[PDB]
Design a protein around this ligand. Structure first.
Ligand SMILES: O=C(CCC1CCCC1)NO
Ligand SMILES: [K+]
Ligand SMILES: [K+]
Ligand SMILES: [Zn+2]
Length: 367
């Protein structure tokens, strides 16, 4: 049984009329119908999950709104208070960083996004489900303990991991983040805490700026329980699967989590506007396959995927479908872009890629 979360409101997130920041007449940033983060991209993924027939192999799980208690396991009372505040504004608005906006009442959606991750986590932990994918929106991994950031209101995977820790009594949880941007929020939240191993693969210094260096290793009892794998622009399937094999999977096996949560972004894809990486649907397929197999070996198959970023409405649905197919074991459709993308490269491990990953291998000794 493979759980699947999609709530209609995930597709109703109001991304304004700007491209990234708001439209601005003095800067001459013309308004546009689809912001970079427009919910249509993730909606097209959900619709492909249905139209492909994958939905018939999935167990639909209703999102439940994350409570104040749930949120406070990951975030400060002050941040919760502040998002209540901004969502209660007549029109809502931007939440701090000049991208991240919410509508009036957009808190409802941020709760359903975090609660989607929590609900799926709860039901995978009870053994009701073997695994699942929570196709949530808004995303989570940039939101640190005390803020919203980079389209993220609450850190969904951290709320889920906080729930697994405090409510389910798990001693150890791993969050593996392969969204192409650094999971700075997740890293912040669990920084001093060895009970949640936080791992991020990302294009080096893509977003946020000055974040995600491999020197950022946690502090105190948490020292050695945060691992960044910054990769160079242009890295493709070869670099990513090498990072999986040399760093990620050895880290998980060393750490022995009771649950693996994957912050599953597809912005590392070959066609994404918001990074310069070259991963194809087959790359994501292999990443998902390896991680699922790892969970089968070390924590009774307990794996929960939770949607992060990804900005190609064209190609993201096929990258996400590939992950879903690895969960169901039913392989319904080809990637129709495969022939087109396969000639572009990324499938050879370049020296600079190899070297970036090798810098990380020594950190495994501290788990
Ligand atoms: O996908 C995300 C958010 C993308 C950032 C890049 C533009 C500012 C927000 N992070 O992983
Ligand atoms: K990442
Ligand atoms: K940690
Ligand atoms: Zn991202």
């Amino acid at each position: 049984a493979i759980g699947y979360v999609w709530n209609t409101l995930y597709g109703w997130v109001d991304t304004g009329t700007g491209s990234l920041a708001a439209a601005n007449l003095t800067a001459r940033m013309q308004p546009i119908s689809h912001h970079l983060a427009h919910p249509d991209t993730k909606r097209r993924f959900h619709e492909l999950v249905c139209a492909s027939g994958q939905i018939e192999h999935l167990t639909p799980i209703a999102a439940v709104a994350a409570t104040d208690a749930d949120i406070l396991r990951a975030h400060s009372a002050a941040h919760l208070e502040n998002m209540k505040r901004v969502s209660n504004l007549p029109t809502g608005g931007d939440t701090g960083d000049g991208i991240t906006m919410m509508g009036n009442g957009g808190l409802e959606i941020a709760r359903l996004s975090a609660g989607g991750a929590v609900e799926l986590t709860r039901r995978v932990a009870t053994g009701e489900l073997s695994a699942g994918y929570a196709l949530v929106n808004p995303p989570g991994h940039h939101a640190p303990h005390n803020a919203a950031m980079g389209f993220c209101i609450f850190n969904n995977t951290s709320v889920a991991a906080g729930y697994a820790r405090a409510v389910l009594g798990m001693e150890r949880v791993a969050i593996l983040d392969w969204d192409v941007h650094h999971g700075n929020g997740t890293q912040d939240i669990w920084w001093n805490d060895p009970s949640v191993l936080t791992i991020s693969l990302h294009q080096h210094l893509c977003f946020p700026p000055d974040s995600g260096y491999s020197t950022e290793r946690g502090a105190g009892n948490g020292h050695g329980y945060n691992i960044n794998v910054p990769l160079p622009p242009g890295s493709g399937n070869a670099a990513y699967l090498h990072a999986m094999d040399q760093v990620v999977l050895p880290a998980l096996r060393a750490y022995r989590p009771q649950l693996i949560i994957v912050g599953s972004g597809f912005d590392a894809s070959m066609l994404d506007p918001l990074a310069r990486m070259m991963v194809t649907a087959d790359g994501f397929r292999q990443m998902a396959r390896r991680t699922i197999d790892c969970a089968a070996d070390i924590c009774d198959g307990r794996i929960v995927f939770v949607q992060e970023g990804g900005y190609s409405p064209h190609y993201l649905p096929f990258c996400g479908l590939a992950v879903i197919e690895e969960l169901t074991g039913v392989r319904s459709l080809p990637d129709p872009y495969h022939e087109f993308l396969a000639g572009m490269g990324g499938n050879t491990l370049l020296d600079a890629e190899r070297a970036a990953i090798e810098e990380i291998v020594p950190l495994l000794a501290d788990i």
